[PDB]
XYZ file of C-alpha atoms in Angstrom:
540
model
C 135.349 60.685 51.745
C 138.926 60.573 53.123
C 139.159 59.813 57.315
C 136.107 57.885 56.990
C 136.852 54.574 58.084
C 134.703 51.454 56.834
C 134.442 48.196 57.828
C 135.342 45.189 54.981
C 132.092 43.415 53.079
C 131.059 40.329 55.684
C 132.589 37.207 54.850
C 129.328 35.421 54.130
C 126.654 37.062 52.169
C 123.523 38.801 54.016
C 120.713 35.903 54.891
C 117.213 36.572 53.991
C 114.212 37.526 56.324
C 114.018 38.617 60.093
C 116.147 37.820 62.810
C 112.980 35.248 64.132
C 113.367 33.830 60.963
C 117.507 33.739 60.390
C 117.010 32.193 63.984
C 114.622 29.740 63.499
C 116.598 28.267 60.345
C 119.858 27.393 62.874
C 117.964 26.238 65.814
C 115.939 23.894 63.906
C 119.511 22.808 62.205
C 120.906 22.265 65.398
C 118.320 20.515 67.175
C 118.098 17.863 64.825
C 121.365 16.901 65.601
C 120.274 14.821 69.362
C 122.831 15.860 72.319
C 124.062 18.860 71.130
C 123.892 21.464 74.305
C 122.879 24.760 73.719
C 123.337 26.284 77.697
C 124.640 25.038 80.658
C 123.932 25.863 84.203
C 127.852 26.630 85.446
C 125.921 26.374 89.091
C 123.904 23.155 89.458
C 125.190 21.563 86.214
C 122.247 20.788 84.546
C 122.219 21.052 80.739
C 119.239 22.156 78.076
C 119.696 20.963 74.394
C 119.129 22.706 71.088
C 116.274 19.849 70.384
C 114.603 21.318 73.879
C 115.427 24.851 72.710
C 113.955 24.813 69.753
C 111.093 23.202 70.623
C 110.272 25.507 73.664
C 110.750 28.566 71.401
C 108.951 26.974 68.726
C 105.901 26.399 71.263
C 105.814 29.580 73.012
C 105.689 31.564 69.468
C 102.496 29.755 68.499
C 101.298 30.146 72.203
C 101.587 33.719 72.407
C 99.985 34.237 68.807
C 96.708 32.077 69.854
C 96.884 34.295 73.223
C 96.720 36.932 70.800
C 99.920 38.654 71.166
C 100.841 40.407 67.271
C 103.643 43.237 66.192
C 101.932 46.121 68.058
C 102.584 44.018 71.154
C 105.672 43.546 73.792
C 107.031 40.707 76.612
C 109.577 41.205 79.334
C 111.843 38.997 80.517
C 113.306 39.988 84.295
C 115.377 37.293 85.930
C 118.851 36.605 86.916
C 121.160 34.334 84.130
C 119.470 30.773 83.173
C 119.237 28.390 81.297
C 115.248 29.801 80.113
C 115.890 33.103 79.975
C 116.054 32.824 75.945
C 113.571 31.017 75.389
C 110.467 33.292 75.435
C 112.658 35.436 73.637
C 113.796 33.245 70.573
C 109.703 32.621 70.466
C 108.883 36.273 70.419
C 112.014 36.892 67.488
C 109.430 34.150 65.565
C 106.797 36.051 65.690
C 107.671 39.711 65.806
C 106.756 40.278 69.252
C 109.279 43.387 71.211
C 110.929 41.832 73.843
C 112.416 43.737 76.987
C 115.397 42.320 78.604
C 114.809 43.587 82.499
C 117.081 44.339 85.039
C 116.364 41.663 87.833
C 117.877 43.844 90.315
C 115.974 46.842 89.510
C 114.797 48.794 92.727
C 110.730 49.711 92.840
C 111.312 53.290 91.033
C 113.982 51.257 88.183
C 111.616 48.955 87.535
C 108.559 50.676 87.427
C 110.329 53.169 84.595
C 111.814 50.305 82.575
C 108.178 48.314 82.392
C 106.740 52.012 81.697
C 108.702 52.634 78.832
C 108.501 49.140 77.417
C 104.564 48.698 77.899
C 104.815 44.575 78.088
C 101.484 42.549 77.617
C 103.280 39.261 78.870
C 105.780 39.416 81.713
C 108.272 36.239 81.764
C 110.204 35.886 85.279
C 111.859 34.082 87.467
C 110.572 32.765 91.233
C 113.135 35.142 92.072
C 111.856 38.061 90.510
C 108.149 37.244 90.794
C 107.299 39.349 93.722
C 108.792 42.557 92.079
C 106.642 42.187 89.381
C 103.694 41.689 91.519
C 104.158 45.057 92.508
C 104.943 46.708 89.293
C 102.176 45.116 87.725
C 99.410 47.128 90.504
C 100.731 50.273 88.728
C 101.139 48.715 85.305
C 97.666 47.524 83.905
C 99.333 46.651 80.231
C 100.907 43.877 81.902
C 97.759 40.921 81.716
C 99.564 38.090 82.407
C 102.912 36.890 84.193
C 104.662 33.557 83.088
C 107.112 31.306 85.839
C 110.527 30.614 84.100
C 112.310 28.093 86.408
C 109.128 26.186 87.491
C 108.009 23.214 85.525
C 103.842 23.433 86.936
C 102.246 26.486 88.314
C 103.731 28.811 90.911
C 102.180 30.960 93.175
C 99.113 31.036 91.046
C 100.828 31.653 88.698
C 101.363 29.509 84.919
C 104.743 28.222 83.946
C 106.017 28.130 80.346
C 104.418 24.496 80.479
C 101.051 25.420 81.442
C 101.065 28.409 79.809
C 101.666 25.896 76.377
C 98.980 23.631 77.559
C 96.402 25.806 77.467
C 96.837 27.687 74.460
C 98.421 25.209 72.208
C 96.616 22.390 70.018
C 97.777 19.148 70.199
C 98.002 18.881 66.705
C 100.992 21.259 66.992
C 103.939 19.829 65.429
C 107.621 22.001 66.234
C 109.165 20.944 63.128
C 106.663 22.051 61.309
C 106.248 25.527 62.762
C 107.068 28.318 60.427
C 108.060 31.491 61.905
C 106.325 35.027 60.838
C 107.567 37.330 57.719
C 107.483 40.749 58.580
C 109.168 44.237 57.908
C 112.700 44.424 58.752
C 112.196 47.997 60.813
C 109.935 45.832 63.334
C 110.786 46.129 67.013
C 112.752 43.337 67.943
C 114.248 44.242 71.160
C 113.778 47.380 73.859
C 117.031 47.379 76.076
C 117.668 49.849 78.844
C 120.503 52.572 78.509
C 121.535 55.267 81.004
C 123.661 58.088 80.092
C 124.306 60.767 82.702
C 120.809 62.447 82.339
C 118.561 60.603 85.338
C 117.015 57.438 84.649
C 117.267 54.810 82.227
C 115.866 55.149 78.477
C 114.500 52.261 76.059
C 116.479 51.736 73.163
C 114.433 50.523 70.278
C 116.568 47.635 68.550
C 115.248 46.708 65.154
C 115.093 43.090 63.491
C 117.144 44.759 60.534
C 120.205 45.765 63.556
C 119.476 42.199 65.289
C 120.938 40.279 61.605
C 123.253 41.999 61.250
C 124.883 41.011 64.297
C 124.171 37.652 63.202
C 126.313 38.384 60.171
C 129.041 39.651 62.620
C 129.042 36.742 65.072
C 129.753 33.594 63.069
C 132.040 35.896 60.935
C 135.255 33.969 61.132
C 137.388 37.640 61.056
C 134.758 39.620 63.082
C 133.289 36.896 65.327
C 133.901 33.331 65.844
C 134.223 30.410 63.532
C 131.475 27.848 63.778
C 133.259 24.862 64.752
C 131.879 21.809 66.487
C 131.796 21.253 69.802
C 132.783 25.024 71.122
C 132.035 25.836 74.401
C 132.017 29.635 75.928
C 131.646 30.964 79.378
C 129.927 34.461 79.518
C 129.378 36.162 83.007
C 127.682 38.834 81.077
C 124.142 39.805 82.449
C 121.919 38.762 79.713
C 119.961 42.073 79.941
C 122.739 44.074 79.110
C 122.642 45.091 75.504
C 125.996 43.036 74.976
C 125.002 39.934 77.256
C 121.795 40.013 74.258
C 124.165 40.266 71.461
C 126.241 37.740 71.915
C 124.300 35.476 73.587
C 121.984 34.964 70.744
C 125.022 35.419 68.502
C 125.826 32.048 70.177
C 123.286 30.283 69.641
C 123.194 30.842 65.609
C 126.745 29.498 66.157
C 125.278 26.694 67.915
C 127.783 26.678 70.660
C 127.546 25.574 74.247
C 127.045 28.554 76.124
C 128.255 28.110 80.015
C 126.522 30.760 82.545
C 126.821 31.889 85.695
C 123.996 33.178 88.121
C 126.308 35.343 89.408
C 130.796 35.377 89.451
C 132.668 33.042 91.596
C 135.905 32.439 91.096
C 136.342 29.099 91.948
C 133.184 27.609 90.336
C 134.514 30.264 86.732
C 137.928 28.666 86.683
C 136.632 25.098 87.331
C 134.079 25.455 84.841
C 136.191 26.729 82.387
C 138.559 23.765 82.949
C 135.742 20.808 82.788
C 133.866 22.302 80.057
C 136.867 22.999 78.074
C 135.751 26.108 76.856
C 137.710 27.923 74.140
C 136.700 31.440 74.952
C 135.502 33.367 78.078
C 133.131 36.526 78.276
C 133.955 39.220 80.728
C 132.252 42.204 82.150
C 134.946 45.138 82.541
C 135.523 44.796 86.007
C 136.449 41.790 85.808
C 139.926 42.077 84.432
C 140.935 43.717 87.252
C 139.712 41.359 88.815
C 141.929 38.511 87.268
C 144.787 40.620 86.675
C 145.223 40.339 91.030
C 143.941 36.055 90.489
C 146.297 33.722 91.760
C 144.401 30.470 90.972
C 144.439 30.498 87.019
C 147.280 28.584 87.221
C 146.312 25.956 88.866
C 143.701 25.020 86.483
C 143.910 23.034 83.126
C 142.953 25.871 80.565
C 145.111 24.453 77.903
C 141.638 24.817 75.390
C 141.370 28.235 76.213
C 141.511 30.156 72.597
C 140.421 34.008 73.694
C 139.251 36.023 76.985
C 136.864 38.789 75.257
C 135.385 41.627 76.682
C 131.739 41.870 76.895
C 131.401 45.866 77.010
C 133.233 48.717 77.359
C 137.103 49.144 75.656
C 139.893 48.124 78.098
C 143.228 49.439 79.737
C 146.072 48.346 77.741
C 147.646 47.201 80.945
C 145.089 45.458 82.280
C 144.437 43.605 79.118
C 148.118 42.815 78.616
C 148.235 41.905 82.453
C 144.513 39.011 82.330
C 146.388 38.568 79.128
C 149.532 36.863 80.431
C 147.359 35.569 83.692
C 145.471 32.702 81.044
C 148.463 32.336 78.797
C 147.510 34.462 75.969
C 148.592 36.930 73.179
C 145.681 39.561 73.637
C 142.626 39.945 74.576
C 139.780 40.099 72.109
C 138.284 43.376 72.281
C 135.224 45.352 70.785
C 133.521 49.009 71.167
C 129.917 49.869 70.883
C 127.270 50.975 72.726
C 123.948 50.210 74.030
C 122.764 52.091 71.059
C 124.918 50.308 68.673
C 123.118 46.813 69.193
C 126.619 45.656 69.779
C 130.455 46.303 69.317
C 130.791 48.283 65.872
C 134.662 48.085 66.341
C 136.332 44.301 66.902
C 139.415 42.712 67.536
C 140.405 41.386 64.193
C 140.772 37.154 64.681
C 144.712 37.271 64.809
C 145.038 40.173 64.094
C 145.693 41.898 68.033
C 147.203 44.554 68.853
C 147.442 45.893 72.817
C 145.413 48.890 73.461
C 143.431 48.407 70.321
C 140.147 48.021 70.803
C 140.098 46.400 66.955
C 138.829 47.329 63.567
C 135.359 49.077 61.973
C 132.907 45.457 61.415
C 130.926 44.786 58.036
C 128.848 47.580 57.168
C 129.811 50.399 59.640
C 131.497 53.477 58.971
C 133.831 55.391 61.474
C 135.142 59.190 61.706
C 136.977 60.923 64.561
C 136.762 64.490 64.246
C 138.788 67.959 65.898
C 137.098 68.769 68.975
C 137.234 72.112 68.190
C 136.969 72.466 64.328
C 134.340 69.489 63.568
C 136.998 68.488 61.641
C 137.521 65.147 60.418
C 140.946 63.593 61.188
C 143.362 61.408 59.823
C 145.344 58.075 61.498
C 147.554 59.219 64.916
C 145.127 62.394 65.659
C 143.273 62.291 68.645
C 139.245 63.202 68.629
C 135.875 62.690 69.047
C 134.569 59.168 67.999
C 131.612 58.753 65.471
C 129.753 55.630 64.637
C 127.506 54.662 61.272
C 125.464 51.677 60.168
C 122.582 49.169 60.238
C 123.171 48.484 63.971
C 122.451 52.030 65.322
C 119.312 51.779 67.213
C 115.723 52.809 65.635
C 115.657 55.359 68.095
C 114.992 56.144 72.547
C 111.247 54.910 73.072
C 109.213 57.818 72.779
C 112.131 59.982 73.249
C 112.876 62.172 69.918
C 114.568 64.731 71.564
C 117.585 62.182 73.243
C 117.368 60.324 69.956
C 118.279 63.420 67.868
C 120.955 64.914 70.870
C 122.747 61.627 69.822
C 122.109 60.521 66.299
C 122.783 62.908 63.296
C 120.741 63.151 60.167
C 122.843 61.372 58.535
C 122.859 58.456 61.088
C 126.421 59.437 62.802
C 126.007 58.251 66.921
C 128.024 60.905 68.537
C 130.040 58.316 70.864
C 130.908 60.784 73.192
C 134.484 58.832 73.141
C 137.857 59.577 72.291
C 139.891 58.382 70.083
C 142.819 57.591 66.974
C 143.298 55.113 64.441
C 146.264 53.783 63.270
C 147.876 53.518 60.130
C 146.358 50.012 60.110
C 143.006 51.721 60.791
C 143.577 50.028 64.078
C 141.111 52.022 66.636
C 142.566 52.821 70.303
C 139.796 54.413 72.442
C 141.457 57.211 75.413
C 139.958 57.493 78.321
C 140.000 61.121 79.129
C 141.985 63.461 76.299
C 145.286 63.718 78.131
C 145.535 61.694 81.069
C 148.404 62.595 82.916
C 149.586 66.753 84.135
C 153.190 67.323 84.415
C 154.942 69.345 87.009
C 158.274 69.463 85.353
C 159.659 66.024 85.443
C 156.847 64.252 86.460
C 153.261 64.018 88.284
C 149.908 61.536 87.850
C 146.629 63.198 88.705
C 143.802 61.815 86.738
C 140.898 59.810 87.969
C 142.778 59.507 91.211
C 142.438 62.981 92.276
C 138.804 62.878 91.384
C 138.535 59.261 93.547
C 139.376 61.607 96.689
C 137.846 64.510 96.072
C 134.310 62.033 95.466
C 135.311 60.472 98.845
C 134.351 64.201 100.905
C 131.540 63.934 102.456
C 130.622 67.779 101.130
C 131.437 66.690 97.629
C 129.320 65.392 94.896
C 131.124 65.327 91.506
C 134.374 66.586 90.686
C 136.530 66.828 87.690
C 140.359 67.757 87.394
C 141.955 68.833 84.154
C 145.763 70.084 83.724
C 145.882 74.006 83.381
C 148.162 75.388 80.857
C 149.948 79.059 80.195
C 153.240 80.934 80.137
C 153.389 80.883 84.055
C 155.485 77.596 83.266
C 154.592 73.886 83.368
C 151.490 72.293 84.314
C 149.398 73.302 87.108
C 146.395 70.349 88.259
C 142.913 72.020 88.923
C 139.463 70.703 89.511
C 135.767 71.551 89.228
C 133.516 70.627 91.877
C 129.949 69.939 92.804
C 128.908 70.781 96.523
C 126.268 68.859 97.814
C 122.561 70.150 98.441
C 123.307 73.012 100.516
C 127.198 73.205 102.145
C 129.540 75.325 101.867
C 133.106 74.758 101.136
C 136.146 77.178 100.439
C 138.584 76.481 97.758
C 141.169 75.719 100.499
C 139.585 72.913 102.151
C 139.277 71.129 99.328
C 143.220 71.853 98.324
C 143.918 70.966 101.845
C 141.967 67.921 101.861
C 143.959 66.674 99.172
C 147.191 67.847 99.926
C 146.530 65.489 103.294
C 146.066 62.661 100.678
C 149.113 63.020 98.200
C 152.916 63.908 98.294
C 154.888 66.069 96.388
C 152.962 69.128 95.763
C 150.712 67.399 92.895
C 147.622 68.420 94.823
C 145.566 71.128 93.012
C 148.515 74.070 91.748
C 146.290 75.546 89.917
C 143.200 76.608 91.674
C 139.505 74.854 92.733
C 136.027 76.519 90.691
C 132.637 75.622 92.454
C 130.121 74.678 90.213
C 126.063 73.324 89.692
C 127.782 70.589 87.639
C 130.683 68.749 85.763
C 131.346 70.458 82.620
C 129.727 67.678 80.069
C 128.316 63.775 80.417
C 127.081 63.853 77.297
C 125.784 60.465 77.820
C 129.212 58.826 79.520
C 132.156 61.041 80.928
C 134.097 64.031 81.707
C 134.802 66.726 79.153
C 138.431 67.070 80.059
C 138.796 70.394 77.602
C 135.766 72.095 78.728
C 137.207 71.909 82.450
C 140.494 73.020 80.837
C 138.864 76.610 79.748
C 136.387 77.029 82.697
C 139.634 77.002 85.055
C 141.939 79.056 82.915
C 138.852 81.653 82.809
C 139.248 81.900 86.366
C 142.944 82.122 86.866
C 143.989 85.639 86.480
């Protein structure tokens, strides 16, 4: 009981029925209400209302059910950012129809293993990714028919949405009288892609039950955002990333404008963000950095900015403090999940920031970080490995039992593969690493940095360094590393190759171990304690 961590009861009570249906309910809300935008085109400024929205959705879910298309079945949806890219999907929430978010960018072998796993009847795409799903298609005989986003008539023989309607639609449909499907909560509502360490991507099987709950999370004035009139956001989040899903049609049962981006510019972002007066901003990790070195945020009007959020994985305290100060704010508003999770489990509390934090356990989740060693479970200020429980943890991998087991307990505990401490606030801070810094004997920094160069030799394929500890005084640095196929390389060239890349005798004191492969992924990063023992082994 004690060191499990749970998240507070939602602020509003649970809404009845499937995500299709807790959809269709705000849409149809919204839409009545002429003018009100739900996404704008950040690029060529054009703007789609809820009224269109809902109507679109509304008339692709009765399209696809006259096609034929019923629960057993599945679409895909593989194009860059815009304004349609929802659309077939909100349709296919109404009627219980799987939907699988593809990566655009996807080479031939990518894509081909994505629409594998997913098994789509209906492929929706862009012009732009029309020709890649062509191909796939040759190879993939589930897939009967392909549907043009971003073209009003046919393309390339091919039916737009509009067609598409036309021919399968009577015209004695009426939108405001459609009434989406009822169906069983464990129903396959979205498959997203996930890759750990282990090859190529998996499908993660996101239920309609996981799906409402992160519609209880996102207009959750603590744990999401306040629905407030007239709130704009700009998300440079891919919308086939499982977080560029979440909150993206977290958004739209907010009814907010949502801004997007085909792809970053920083110009066109920070003018955008100006005109549009948009009160928050959603970021992809590497962005940060990215601002953190931006000059030009100042010369913009952002005085309606509210937050700057991150859109996936936990951030550097520095670098948050850093984008932090950059738009003239407190904090950045964090949150930690995974693919797996649906979306973040752990949040930035509204108001309630602290630097480094990644936030607080959300409405209906449980949290636990345990002794790396013992299986222990730990109390506040103890450092360990990060466990995750609730109604957002994925269904399971797509006809993978064996990953979905490797990761999720019987008693529904996702094995994060994270570190990490709470507070006495039950304030979460995730560590990257375990450690993260080997001292000589006043002072020496050796992480990530040491494996940066040692990835940068040409003979090298992986590497890991870890701080080697025992009475022969202080803290000697040591790595693992990963030849490539076939070369041969002595434990002295690769000391010497970074001893001609750093000062001051931080270069490997320990001693290099060859090996077939860094100590443990275990779906995400290096197992800094497992390196620890296999070099101490070896030093004798």
């Amino acid at each position: 009981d004690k060191n499990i961590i749970h998240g507070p009861p939602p602020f509003y009570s649970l809404d009845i029925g499937t995500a299709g249906e807790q959809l269709h309910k705000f849409m149809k809300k919204y839409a009545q209400i002429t003018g009100t935008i739900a996404f704008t085109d950040a690029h060529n400024g054009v703007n789609v209302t809820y009224a269109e929205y809902f109507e679109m959705a509304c008339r692709l879910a009765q399209s696809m059910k006259n096609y034929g298309l019923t629960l057993k079945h599945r679409i895909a949806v593989c194009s860059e950012n815009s304004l349609q890219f929802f659309m077939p999907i909100c349709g296919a929430l109404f009627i219980g129809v799987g939907v699988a978010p593809t990566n655009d960018i996807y080479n031939e072998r990518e894509l081909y293993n994505s629409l594998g796993i997913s098994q789509p009847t209906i492929v929706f795409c862009s012009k732009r990714a029309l020709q890649k799903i062509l191909g796939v298609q040759q190879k993939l005989p589930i897939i009967e028919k392909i549907i043009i986003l971003d073209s009003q008539e046919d393309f390339m023989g091919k039916q737009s949405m509009n067609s598409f309607i036309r021919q399968f639609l009577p015209e004695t449909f009426n939108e405001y009288d459609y009434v989406p499907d009822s169906f069983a909560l464990n129903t396959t509502a979205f498959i997203m892609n996930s890759s750990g360490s282990t090859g190529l991507p998996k499908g993660v099987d996101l239920t309609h039950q996981n799906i409402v709950v992160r519609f209880s999370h996102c207009r959750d004035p603590i744990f999401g955002n306040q629905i407030i009139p007239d709130t704009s956001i700009l998300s440079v989040i891919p919308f086939h990333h499982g977080f560029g899903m979440s909150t993206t049609l977290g958004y739209l049962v907010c009814g907010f404008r949502i801004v997007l981006m085909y792809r970053f510019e920083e110009e066109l972002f920070l003018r955008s963000l100006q005109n549009y007066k948009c009160q928050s901003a959603l970021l992809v990790p590497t962005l940060f950095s990215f601002f953190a070195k931006s000059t030009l945020v100042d010369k913009y009007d952002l005085s309606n900015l509210h937050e700057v959020a991150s859109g996936g994985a936990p951030l550097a305290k520095e670098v948050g403090e850093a984008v932090a100060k950059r738009f003239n704010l407190v904090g950045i508003r964090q949150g930690y999940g995974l693919t797996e999770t649906t979306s973040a489990c752990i949040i930035t509390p509204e108001g309630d920031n602290k630097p480094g934090a990644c936030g607080k356990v959300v409405p209906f989740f449980s949290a636990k970080v345990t002794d790396l060693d013992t299986g222990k479970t730990l109390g506040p200020n103890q450092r360990g490995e990060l466990w995750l429980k609730g109604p957002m943890v994925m269904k399971g991998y797509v006809n993978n039992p064996e990953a979905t087991h490797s990761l999720i307990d019987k008693e529904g505990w996702v094995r994060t593969g994270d570190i990490a401490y709470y507070d006495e606030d039950e304030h979460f801070f995730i560590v990257d690493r375990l450690k993260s810094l080997i001292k000589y004997k006043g002072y020496q920094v050796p992480p990530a940095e040491l494996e940066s160069i040692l990835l940068q030799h040409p003979y090298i394929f992986d590497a890991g360094v870890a701080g080697i500890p025992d009475p022969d005084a202080g803290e000697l640095p040591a790595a693992v590393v990963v030849l490539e196929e076939g070369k041969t390389m002595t434990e002295k060239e690769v000391m010497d190759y970074v001893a001609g890349q750093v000062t001051s005798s931080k270069r490997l004191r320990g001693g290099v171990k060859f090996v077939d492969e860094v100590p443990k992924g275990l779906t995400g990063k290096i197992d800094g304690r497992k390196i620890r023992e296999i070099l101490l082994k070896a030093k004798k």
